[PDB]
Design a protein around this ligand. Structure first.
Ligand SMILES: CCCCCCCCCCCCCCCCCC(=O)OC[C@H](COP(=O)([O-])OCC(O)COP(=O)([O-])OC[C@@H](COC(=O)CCCCCCCCCCCCCCCCC)OC(=O)CCCCCCCCCCCCCCCCC)OC(=O)CCCCCCCCCCCCCCCCC
Ligand SMILES: CCCCCCCCCCCCCCCCCC(=O)OC[C@H](COP(=O)([O-])OCC[N+](C)(C)C)OC(=O)CCCCCCCCCCCCCCCCC
Ligand SMILES: CCCCCCCCCCCCCCCCCC(=O)OC[C@H](COP(=O)([O-])OCC[N+](C)(C)C)OC(=O)CCCCCCCCCCCCCCCCC
Ligand SMILES: CCCCCCCCCCCCCCCCCC(=O)OC[C@H](COP(=O)([O-])OCC[N+](C)(C)C)OC(=O)CCCCCCCCCCCCCCCCC
Ligand SMILES: CCCCCCCCCCCCCCCCCC(=O)OC[C@H](COP(=O)(O)OCCN)OC(=O)CCCCCCCCCCCCCCCCC
Ligand SMILES: CCCCCCCCCCCCCCCCCC(=O)OC[C@H](COP(=O)(O)OCCN)OC(=O)CCCCCCCCCCCCCCCCC
Ligand SMILES: CCCCCCCCCCCCCCCCCC(=O)OC[C@H](COP(=O)(O)OCCN)OC(=O)CCCCCCCCCCCCCCCCC
Ligand code: SF4
Ligand code: SF4
Ligand code: SF4
Lengths: 166, 334, 153, 67, 185, 56, 75, 85, 85
């Protein structure tokens, strides 16, 4: 299946960079190994483009109601000091609503579902971990097969259990 | 004779056995340092100068560690397997010639002695897995016993081809018969098969399921603590060195090179050592270079690749010997 | 007296020279712990070999967040370690609960479950910080009195 | 991992006594210029022709060296 | 599976090739099998690495690199005069993601706004630098130190005395790290 | 028995016993025996009842 | 501690005689349990549990065994 | 005393010393139904084919130390024997 | 470069083989009376050594004399045993 979240729903600067998507054909551990080895080369290819396309300017959104002001501003002018005080004690308020946002994480589609109530604390944060869905398929991919192949498919799933359990 | 026979036998035994264990200790240190250089690292360099005391630290640590035996199945049976494995792994050094006739026992049936003592060593592994009273570890020790006997067939089939060339089971005569040519040239496929069989026979990588912990069901050797670990590990390094010595004896001309008795003996010992050390290096080299073969694949490799080739060579080689009038004499010569 | 110190030095030199941890790699601290075996630091150069089973191991490194669901397993492997044995708590989570100290599912420090010989701070401690703690435990072994302790009483 | 030419040269620049002492703590044959000494007595050295991250090193004042 | 629209050009693979149709000679095929050519090539790679320089450094005689931003052991700092930098704003206690800081404060004998309790539970702290980012006077900082493993857990409950002593000992590093990175803060 | 045969000079047959009987026949017997379910209680005959016949 | 010494051999001829003018568990509100209540609990991990040691199979057990294949012939 | 007898005794002695050290000086503490399942027939086959093939190799070892007297005639019978197995 | 420290254990292993070879050659030579030893000794060889001892007293003793000393015709050893025939 040719599908990459960076291609289908571009985020950050992935629409400004060139790269290829490795896709297998047999759906086995060997194809998934070859896709990951080629992903090494496309990652390096993207990094080189980012080195040359790096623009000048600020690295934090320029509203001190959301991002903390520079330390020199915070010690210099009244407005910056207030915004520094509030962001580190109350935090910024996030408009109410909800969103499901997904990226192409190294282990697959990582998503997060956040519900905002308008306050400075999130009402609900649910994390969609690709390793959770993958390990839930372990029975489907391993039933009828050899015990001596289980280590191969545990490794073919990119499994970190901080992702799985959260 | 000149002095007491008992004194001679004491000294001859001490000269072979004691420096052997020193060499086995430093093969483990050399394994760690060779894989490290291959892995862009150092390996042991802090326990003793240049890491030269590392194996002695390991052995003393394990010898003073507490042993956790099974749920009182039997005291004798639990140690019985480890003891057998170590003793018979070391017994094969007694027929190694460090020069013509320079062996603890210059035996005319020496090749068959080496085969017998190796067969008696597989018992300890099988008797250990059962004694552990864990059906999970028994199956791994069972798979390890199946691999050891199957590749014992590979080694004794390869050795039969060398005996056809030399016409003798004396290790000395095999070596002397290579002054004509090292058998690795005429028997080149046999040497490669024999070396592969020797790696499998020693439970060494890529045939290392016995100690593999990442494989879910493997790792029978991984449940061995304190003294039992020392027994099994010493037996394994001892067999690795002996399979490299026997490989040099059969195919690399043994103690042969490329007036005083002391220097002639030293050169023969050194030439055997250099050849043995090279095969120990290759032995380490393959562990670092390859991934691990599954049990079903390694049994299929033995029985559907190596053995069918060897049995084909068992037909061809004596036909060549007869066709060229080169069937050797079997009397005491050399 | 001097003899018993000599055996004391000898037996302690062996405990330091072959330091075999059983890495209970619970979470992200295991990544820093795994970096101690890699070429830059090469723990093997000092004699450290990681061991998969507690039977072959001298030290337990708790490197990760200990959940309530996991604590019985940790106690079980600690009980299966032959003496002499030591425990190193590595990381804020293993130490006192860490970022999850106020969680319903987290043990607020593995010292509620097992006795701990060395606490290594950081979330995660650096590979060098882990090495520093291992050095402290070796210095602890180096000062352990064994034959002189029995000789006192 | 010193290599023969490196170790042979450093031996000549330092002598066998110093060589063996260095082999007793750091386990290597290192030579460089003395950058300075700290309050505790540790000596610090630099050599910019060493391998990366090995260009600076300390000789600890105390036998039971601790970081 | 494929995106909507017409099938991607040449997405369908051509039919499988029979043994007869393989474009590779028997001698080469038999030779690689029996001689294990690709395994020999992999072994040759290891010998190349065997003669390359190792990456190992000899710790603790040598150290790995750290940056002015490195987040290690916490310290409380002074002014050049020796007055405490801390004025009990409680910004670090409020922002702390792990609730590792506990502070109490009143007027000092001279009437200055100062702390009476400043504890950091180092077994709760996640070493994130948020306190150091939130401090308006550069009072709380993380030192570069990472080698302070302790025998007991109680030794990792830092009170104000422990933290002010840490700042006194580490101040030249603390000022150098602040000097290098303050333009970016 | 094998050690006995070796010491009287029957070295080939003595080593053949070690290789064949211990090395392979006994290994096959233990593999099968150590895989099958055995209750030792189900296998104990009252040997005292067989002792008079044993003497005769 | 070898569990064996001169004053320990002498100690085994002596027989525990309970002072009648001494406070007991009664005074503390406690009722000691008998040791035979605790042998099974404390010695359970020391009873062999190998399959070799179960008592012989009942006729109920002999009959059900014939509902299973006991060797994998395909493996 | 034959060098082979002293060798056997010394190797045995080494094994006892290793046991003795860990029995005397190592610590010791009292730190000490079952389901059943069918076993795999492949284990019986490995042992069976090993044993039968181990016997046939054994029967060829006399030929390798007798090739000169056996010459062509003994080679025929050896080849007949090899062909059958 | 060459990692010499990795090669040191091989030098130790190689040197241990040399120590065994040199040592076994020297002690065997002193045992044989300062002459090189025998090997691949068959029954004919053993008998010739016993005949050498009944001429000189030493199993490795040599004499070019065409005439046997008196008592040679009487010192042929008939070996006696109690069980194994
Ligand atoms: C085969 C190809 C392998 C991969 C390709 C290697 C390659 O191209 O690297 C080029 C590589 C690039 O150059 P470089 O890294 O910049 O090194 C420049 C330095 O200035 C160089 O400084 P240096 O001090 O290393 O100079 C080396 C010089 C000085 O080095 C020596 O003299 C040491 C060698 C002899 C002493 C060894 C014994 C030490 C222990 C003695 C006993 C102690 C116990 C008693 O010796 C030589 O000229 C070359 C001799 C190489 C011998 C390698 C040792 C055997 C390795 C395989 C062992 C297998 C069995 C174990 O060159 C080297 O690494 C130097 C060695 C040249 C390659 C030799 C390959 C031989 C392989 C034989 C198998
Ligand atoms: C034992 C059989 C030895 C056979 C031949 C071995 C050749 C190699 C010898 C290596 C040991 C040389 C001495 C040594 O390094 O000990 C350092 C030891 C110290 O060991 P260490 O671990 O503290 O070494 C410190 C140096 N660093 C940490 C940097 C690597 O010093 C001694 O106390 C030596 C005196 C006792 C020696 C006991 C072992 C002697 C072995 C040879 C006899
Ligand atoms: C096979 C069975 C296992 C092997 C048993 C024999 C092992 C070979 C000999 C090893 C002897 C111990 C190592 C040498 C002594 C030593 O530790 O030196 C460093 C010791 C100190 O060891 P240390 O542990 O305090 O040093 C620490 C080193 N770092 C910092 C790297 C961790 O030197 C001394 O200060 C005391 C010396 C005491 C006297 C020397 C004892 C020699 C005993 C030889 C016995 C031979 C039998
Ligand atoms: C040389 C080896 C023999 C040394 C002389 C005998 C040992 C010292 C005399 C008795 C001391 C008893 C100490 C007991 C103790 O401390 O308990 C802890 C433990 C014993 O714990 P334990 O008290 O529970 O022992 C139990 C005893 N059983 C099991 C029978 C119930 O002792 C040790 O760990 C051993 C330390 C000393 C032995 C180290 C041997 C190393 C030898 C290497 C070569 C050295 C060459 C030197 C020249
Ligand atoms: C010392 C001097 C140098 C020594 C070199 C040692 C080289 C490393 C040895 C490591 C161990 C050997 C690894 C063998 C790996 C293996 O077993 O591969 C299994 C492979 C499977 O092949 P097969 O089952 O027949 O079916 C193929 C169709 N897919 O089957 C095969 O690939 C078999 C092909 C190899 C045959 C080698 C034996 C013949 C030797 C020449 C004759
Ligand atoms: C075990 C030890 C290794 C044994 C194998 C190594 C020797 C291999 C010899 C080469 C095998 C094939 C020889 C041959 O003639 O191949 C030609 C034929 C097909 O021709 P082809 O190469 O495919 O045409 C080009 C298409 N691109 O292919 C064929 O028709 C097959 C013909 C096979 C004839 C083999 C004769 C040589 C036997 C060597 C035995 C070695 C004994 C010593 C060990
Ligand atoms: C019990 C030991 C029985 C005696 C075995 C023996 O010593 O014979 C040695 C034999 C080869 O030695 P050989 O030259 O034939 O005869 C010398 C006799 N002193 O050696 C052999 O043929 C086989 C040796 C088998 C292992 C002997 C040790 C068994 C006990 C190990 C525990
Ligand atoms: S202490 Fe920090 S780095 Fe270590 S396991 Fe817990 S969260 Fe991960
Ligand atoms: S350390 Fe800084 S942020 Fe925290 S109370 Fe003191 S002044 Fe406020
Ligand atoms: S580093 Fe982070 S967790 Fe630790 S005290 Fe400062 S804000 Fe709290």
């Amino acid at each position: 299946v040719p599908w990459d979240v960076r291609k289908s729903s571009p985020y950050d600067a992935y629409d400004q960079v060139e790269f290829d998507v490795p896709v297998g054909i047999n759906g086995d551990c060997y194809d998934r190994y070859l896709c990951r080895m080629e992903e090494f080369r496309q990652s390096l290819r993207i990094i080189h483009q980012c080195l040359n396309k790096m623009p000048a300017g600020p690295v934090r959104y320029e509203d001190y109601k959301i991002t903390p002001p520079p330390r020199a501003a915070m010690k210099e002018n009244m407005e910056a000091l207030i915004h520094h005080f509030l962001l580190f004690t109350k935090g910024y308020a996030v408009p109410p609503g909800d969103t499901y946002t997904a990226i192409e994480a190294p282990k697959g589609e990582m998503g997060v579902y956040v519900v905002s109530d308008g306050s400075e604390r999130p009402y609900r944060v649910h994390i969609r971990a690709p390793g959770f869905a993958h390990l839930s398929g372990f029975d489907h991919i391993t039933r009828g097969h050899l015990l001596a192949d289980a280590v191969a498919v545990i490794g073919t799933m990119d499994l970190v259990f901080g992702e799985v359990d959260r | 004779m000149s002095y007491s026979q008992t004194i001679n036998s004491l000294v001859e035994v001490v000269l072979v056995l004691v420096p052997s264990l020193v060499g086995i200790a430093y093969v483990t240190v050399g394994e760690r340092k060779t894989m490290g250089s291959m892995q862009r690292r150092l390996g042991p360099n802090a326990v003793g100068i240049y890491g030269l005391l590392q194996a002695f630290a390991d052995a003393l640590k394990l010898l003073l560690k507490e042993y956790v035996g099974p749920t009182q199945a039997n005291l004798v049976l639990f140690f019985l397997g480890p003891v057998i494995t170590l003793i018979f792994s070391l017994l094969g050094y007694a027929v190694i010639p460090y020069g013509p006739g320079l062996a603890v026992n210059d035996l005319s049936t020496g090749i068959l002695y080496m085969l017998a003592v190796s067969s008696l060593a597989t018992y300890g592994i099988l008797l250990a897995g059962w004694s552990a009273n864990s059906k999970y570890a028994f199956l791994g020790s069972l798979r390890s016993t199946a691999q050891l006997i199957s590749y014992e067939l590979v080694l004794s089939s390869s050795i039969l081809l060398v005996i056809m060339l030399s016409g003798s089971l004396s290790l000395t005569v095999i070596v002397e018969s290579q002054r004509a040519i090292w058998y690795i040239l005429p028997l080149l496929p046999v040497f490669i098969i024999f070396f592969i069989g020797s790696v499998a026979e020693t439970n060494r990588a890529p045939f290392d399921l016995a100690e593999a912990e990442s494989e879910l069901v493997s790792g029978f050797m991984t449940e061995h603590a304190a003294v039992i670990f020392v027994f099994f590990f010493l037996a394994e390094y001892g067999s690795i060195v002996l399979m490299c010595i026997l490989t040099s004896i059969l195919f690399l001309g043994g103690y042969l090179l490329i007036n005083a008795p002391t220097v002639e003996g030293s050169f023969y010992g050194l030439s055997l050592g250099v050849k043995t050390s090279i095969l120990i290096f290759v032995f380490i080299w393959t562990r670092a270079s390859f991934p691990r073969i599954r049990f079903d694949q390694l049994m299929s490799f033995c029985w559907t690749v190596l053995l069918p080739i060897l049995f084909a060579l068992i037909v061809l080689v004596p036909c060549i010997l007869y066709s060229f009038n080169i069937f050797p004499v079997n009397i005491s010569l050399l | 007296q001097y003899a018993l110190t000599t055996l004391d030095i000898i037996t302690n030199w062996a405990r330091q020279g072959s330091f075999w941890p059983m890495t209970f790699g619970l979470a992200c601290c295991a990544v820093e712990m795994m970096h101690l075996s890699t070429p830059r630091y090469d723990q093997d150069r000092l004699g450290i070999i990681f061991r998969a089973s507690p039977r072959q191991s001298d030290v337990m490194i708790v490197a990760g967040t200990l959940t309530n669901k996991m604590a019985p397993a940790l106690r079980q492997v600690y009980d299966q370690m032959p003496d002499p044995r030591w425990v190193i708590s590595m990381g804020s989570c293993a130490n006192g609960g860490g970022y999850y100290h106020y969680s319903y599912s987290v043990v607020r420090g593995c010292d509620r479950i097992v006795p701990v010989d060395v606490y290594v701070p950081g979330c995660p401690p650096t590979s060098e910080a882990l090495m520093y703690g291992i050095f402290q435990l070796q210095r602890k072994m180096r000062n352990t009195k064994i034959t002189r302790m029995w000789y006192r009483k | 991992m010193s290599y023969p030419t490196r170790t042979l040269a450093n031996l000549r620049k330092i002598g066998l006594k110093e060589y063996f002492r260095q082999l007793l703590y750091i386990g290597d044959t290192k030579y460089g210029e003395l950058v300075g000494v700290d309050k505790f007595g540790n000596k610090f050295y630099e050599n910019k022709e060493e391998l990366p991250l090995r260009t600076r090193w300390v000789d600890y004042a105390k036998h039971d060296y601790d970081a | 599976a494929t995106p909507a629209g017409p099938p991607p050009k040449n997405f369908r693979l051509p039919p499988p090739k029979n043994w007869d149709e393989e474009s590779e000679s028997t001698i080469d095929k038999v030779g690689k099998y029996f001689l294990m050519t690709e395994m020999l090539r992999g072994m040759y790679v290891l010998l190349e690495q065997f003669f390359r320089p190792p990456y190992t450094i000899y710790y603790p005689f040598e150290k790995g690199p750290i940056s002015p931003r490195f987040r290690g052991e916490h310290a409380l700092r002074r002014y050049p005069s020796g007055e405490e930098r801390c004025i009990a704003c409680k910004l670090c206690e409020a922002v702390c993601p792990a609730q590792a800081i506990t502070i109490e404060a009143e007027e000092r004998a001279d009437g200055s706004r100062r702390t009476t309790r400043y504890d950091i539970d180092m077994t709760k702290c996640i070493y994130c630098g948020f306190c150091q980012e939130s401090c308006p006077v550069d009072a709380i900082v993380e030192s570069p130190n990472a080698e302070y493993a302790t025998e007991t857990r109680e030794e990792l409950l830092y009170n104000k005395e422990k933290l002010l002593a840490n700042g006194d000992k580490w101040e030249p590093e603390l000022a150098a790290a602040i000097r290098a990175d303050a333009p970016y803060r | 028995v094998s050690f006995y045969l070796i010491l009287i000079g029957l070295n080939f047959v003595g080593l053949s016993y070690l290789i064949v009987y211990i090395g392979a026949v006994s290994i096959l017997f233990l593999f099968i025996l150590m895989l099958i379910n055995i209750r030792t209680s189900e296998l104990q005959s009252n040997t005292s009842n067989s002792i008079p016949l044993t003497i005769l | 501690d070898t569990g064996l010494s001169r004053d320990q051999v002498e100690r085994e001829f002596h027989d525990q005689v309970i002072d009648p003018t001494a406070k007991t568990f009664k005074d503390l509100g406690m009722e000691p349990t008998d040791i035979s209540k605790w042998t099974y609990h404390y010695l359970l991990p020391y009873r062999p549990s190998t399959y070799y040691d179960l008592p012989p199979s009942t006729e109920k057990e002999m009959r059900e065994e014939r509902k299973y294949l006991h060797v994998l012939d395909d493996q | 005393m034959s060098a082979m007898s002293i060798y056997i005794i010394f190797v045995s002695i080494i094994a006892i010393l290793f046991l003795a050290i860990d029995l005397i000086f190592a610590p010791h503490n009292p730190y000490k139904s079952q389901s059943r399942s069918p076993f795999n027939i492949s284990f019986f086959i490995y042992g069976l084919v090993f044993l039968l093939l181990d016997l046939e190799i054994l029967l060829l070892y006399p030929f390798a130390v007798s090739e000169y007297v056996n010459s062509a005639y003994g080679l025929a019978a050896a080849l007949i024997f090899i062909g059958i197995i | 470069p060459v990692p010499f420290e990795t090669l040191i254990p091989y030098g130790i292993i190689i040197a241990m083989f040399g120590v065994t070879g040199a040592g076994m050659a020297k002690v065997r030579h002193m045992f044989n009376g300062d002459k090189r030893h025998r090997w691949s000794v068959d029954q004919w060889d053993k008998q010739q050594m016993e005949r050498d001892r009944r001429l000189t007293g030493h199993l490795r003793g040599q004499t070019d004399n065409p005439i046997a000393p008196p008592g040679f015709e009487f010192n042929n050893p008939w070996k006696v045993x109690x069980x194994x025939x």
